[PDB]
Design an enzyme around this catalytic site. Structure first.
Site, PDB file in Angstrom:
ATOM      1  N   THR A 275       0.825  -1.219   0.000  1.00 46.49           N
ATOM      2  CA  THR A 275       0.000   0.000   0.000  1.00 46.49           C
ATOM      3  C   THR A 275       0.857   1.265   0.000  1.00 46.49           C
ATOM      4  OG1 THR A 275      -0.150  -0.135   2.429  1.00 46.49           O
ATOM      5  CG2 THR A 275      -2.055  -0.954   1.165  1.00 46.49           C
TER       6      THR A 275
ATOM      7  N   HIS B  61      11.672  -7.256 -26.850  1.00 43.66           N
ATOM      8  CA  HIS B  61      10.464  -6.658 -26.277  1.00 43.66           C
ATOM      9  C   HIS B  61       9.483  -7.704 -25.746  1.00 43.66           C
ATOM     10  CE1 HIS B  61       6.575  -4.349 -26.378  1.00 43.66           C
ATOM     11  NE2 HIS B  61       7.365  -3.377 -25.959  1.00 43.66           N
TER      12      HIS B  61
ATOM     13  N   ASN C 238       2.468   5.430 -25.308  1.00 44.34           N
ATOM     14  CA  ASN C 238       3.556   6.242 -24.744  1.00 44.34           C
ATOM     15  C   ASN C 238       3.666   7.652 -25.325  1.00 44.34           C
ATOM     16  OD1 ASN C 238       4.459   3.839 -23.294  1.00 44.34           O
ATOM     17  ND2 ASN C 238       5.404   3.194 -25.215  1.00 44.34           N
TER      18      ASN C 238
ATOM     19  N   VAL D  14     -11.904  -3.786 -23.012  1.00 45.80           N
ATOM     20  CA  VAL D  14     -10.677  -4.449 -22.567  1.00 45.80           C
ATOM     21  C   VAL D  14     -10.048  -3.669 -21.391  1.00 45.80           C
ATOM     22  CG1 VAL D  14     -10.372  -5.556 -24.829  1.00 45.80           C
ATOM     23  CG2 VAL D  14      -9.195  -3.378 -24.349  1.00 45.80           C
TER      24      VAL D  14
ATOM     25  N   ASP E 254      -8.168   2.145 -17.406  1.00 43.58           N
ATOM     26  CA  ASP E 254      -8.820   1.372 -16.363  1.00 43.58           C
ATOM     27  C   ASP E 254      -8.026   1.317 -15.066  1.00 43.58           C
ATOM     28  OD1 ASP E 254     -11.289   0.238 -17.744  1.00 43.58           O
ATOM     29  OD2 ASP E 254      -9.730  -0.347 -19.154  1.00 43.58           O
TER      30      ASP E 254
ATOM     31  N   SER F 156       4.182  -0.574 -22.132  1.00 35.71           N
ATOM     32  CA  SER F 156       4.442  -1.966 -22.491  1.00 35.71           C
ATOM     33  C   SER F 156       4.882  -2.807 -21.289  1.00 35.71           C
ATOM     34  CB  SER F 156       5.507  -2.071 -23.590  1.00 35.71           C
ATOM     35  OG  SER F 156       4.990  -1.685 -24.861  1.00 35.71           O
TER      36      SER F 156
HETATM   37 CA   LIG Z   1     -11.854  -0.776 -20.187  1.00 38.67          CA
END
Ligand SMILES: [Ca+2]
Lengths: 8, 279
Positions: B16, B69, B161, B177, B200, B224
Site C-alpha cells: 500500500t 520486447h 507512450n 478491454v 482502467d 508496455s
Molecule cells: Ca476498459
C-alpha cells in the site's frame, strides 16, 4: 500498429 | 511467499506504500492459468521461464524473438525472478517483427488466433492475453480486441507512450478491454504515459527489470512494461478464484490502491494495481 520499436 | 530484493514493480503491487523491496504473494502463483503474450515472440529457452514458455504462432519467417520486447513483457508476466505470476503458463504469438513493427491485419489475425487456440489448451484457471502494442485509432483493431475479450480471455493492453489522451489509439481505446497506464517508483504517472477516461488502471512502467534475449536481463520503460504487470496479476487472481476473465479488470480497479498517484490529469482514474495479499 505504429507505437514502439526502440525510441526512448 | 515473499521475494526479498524484488524488482520495484513487484514490491509495489504487493504494498500500500511505495519504497518497499519485498514482493508478497500467494504460493499458488498463477498455476493452472495461461497468458498469451502477443508481441515480438518469447525466447522460450531462457532459464528464467523454467520451461513454462512456448511459442504457439508466428506471422514471420521465424518464431524467434529477435527484438527482446516480447521476452521482456513475458518475463514480467511470469518469469521466476521478474514475474508477477511465477507459475503461470506462457504462450508466445509473434505479430511484431524484429524491429518491433507489424501491420494491423497481422495483429488482428493474432488476436483471432488466440480466441480459437485457447480451446486447444489446458488452462483450468483461465486465459489472459497481454497486448503491449498499439498505434493510431482503428475501429477494426478495437473490434478484434473486443472479440477476444468476448471469447472469454482477459485482455490487457498498453495505453500508449505519447503523453496524450489514449482515445486516439488502438487497441487502447476499446472500452471493453483493460487499458493500462504506467507509473514510476515514486508513485508519479510516468512522463510518457497516455491518460484519459478510457484508462482502467495503472501499473509499474518506469525502469522495469526483466528478461531479455540471449539469456540476459535489462531494465526498460513503457506502458508496455505496465501491461504485463496487470496481465500477470489477473492470472494470479483467477488462479485464486477471486475473479473471472469477464470481470478481472473491474475487480482489479475495485481492489486497487486509490488516490496514491501524482500527475493524474482530471478525468483519469487514480488507481494502482494491487494484489491485496495478507499472510
Ligand atoms: Ca476498459
Amino acid at each position: 500498429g505504429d507505437e514502439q520499436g526502440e525510441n526512448k | 511467499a515473499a521475494q526479498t530484493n524484488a524488482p520495484w514493480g513487484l514490491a509495489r503491487i504487493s504494498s500500500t506504500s511505495p519504497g518497499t523491496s519485498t514482493y508478497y504473494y500467494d504460493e499458488s502463483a498463477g498455476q493452472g492459468s495461461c497468458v498469451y503474450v502477443i508481441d515480438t515472440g518469447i525466447e522460450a529457452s531462457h532459464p528464467e521461464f523454467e520451461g513454462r514458455a512456448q511459442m504457439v504462432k508466428t506471422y514471420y519467417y521465424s518464431s524467434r524473438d529477435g527484438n527482446g520486447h516480447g521476452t521482456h513483457c513475458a518475463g514480467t508476466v511470469g518469469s521466476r525472478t521478474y514475474g508477477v505470476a511465477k507459475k503461470t503458463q506462457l504462450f508466445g504469438v509473434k505479430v511484431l517483427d524484429d524491429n518491433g513493427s507489424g501491420q494491423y491485419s497481422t495483429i488482428i489475425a493474432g488476436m483471432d488466433f488466440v480466441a480459437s487456440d485457447k480451446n486447444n489448451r489446458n488452462c483450468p484457471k483461465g486465459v489472459v492475453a497481454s497486448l503491449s502494442l498499439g498505434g493510431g485509432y482503428s475501429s477494426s483493431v478495437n473490434s478484434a480486441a473486443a472479440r477476444l475479450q468476448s471469447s472469454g480471455v482477459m485482455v490487457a493492453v498498453a495505453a500508449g507512450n505519447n503523453n496524450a489522451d489514449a482515445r486516439n489509439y488502438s487497441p487502447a481505446s476499446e472500452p471493453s478491454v483493460c487499458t493500462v497506464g504506467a507509473s514510476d517508483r515514486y508513485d508519479r504517472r510516468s512522463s510518457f504515459s497516455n491518460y484519459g477516461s478510457v484508462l482502467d488502471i495503472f501499473g509499474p512502467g518506469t525502469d522495469i527489470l526483466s528478461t531479455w534475449i540471449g539469456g540476459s536481463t535489462r531494465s526498460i520503460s513503457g506502458t508496455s512494461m505496465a501491461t504485463p504487470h496487470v496481465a500477470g496479476l489477473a492470472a494470479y487472481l483467477m488462479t485464486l478464484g477471486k475473479t473471472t476473465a469477464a470481470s478481472a479488470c473491474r475487480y482489479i480497479a475495485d481492489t486497487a490502491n486509490k488516490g496514491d498517484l501524482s500527475n493524474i490529469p482530471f478525468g483519469t482514474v487514480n488507481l494502482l494495481a494491487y494484489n491485496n495479499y495478507q499472510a
